[PDB]
């Protein structure tokens, strides 16, 4: 199936890689809130404590 | 070019995944620092020191 099958393992391959980056964005983004979650906490502490 | 032309866009999406999966591991690698330095930085603050 040389060229069919060529791209039919590419597709295959493109569905994992889009996969990987799905599951990226959704950890970098709830890892991006809750730093500034905690930094919002550290100028608040320090306004009240420093 | 069908075939010949879905195939090369195939190849060409697969780069450009391949390249974004390592920028996003390299964001995220440095978001959990930047959030492990702040998560110190609230801890040393509610034990008093500023």
Redesign the interface.
């Known amino acids: 199936r040389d060229?069919?099958a060529?791209?039919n393992n590419?597709?295959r391959?493109?569905s994992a890689?889009?996969e990987?980056?799905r599951q990226?964005?959704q950890?970098?983004e709830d890892?991006?809130r809750?730093?500034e979650s905690?930094?919002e906490?550290?100028t608040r502490?320090?306004r009240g404590?420093?």
Request: one cysteine or more.
């Open positions: 060229l069919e060529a791209y590419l597709l391959d493109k890689l889009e990987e980056k990226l964005e950890e970098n890892l991006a809750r730093l905690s930094s906490e550290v502490l320090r404590q420093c």
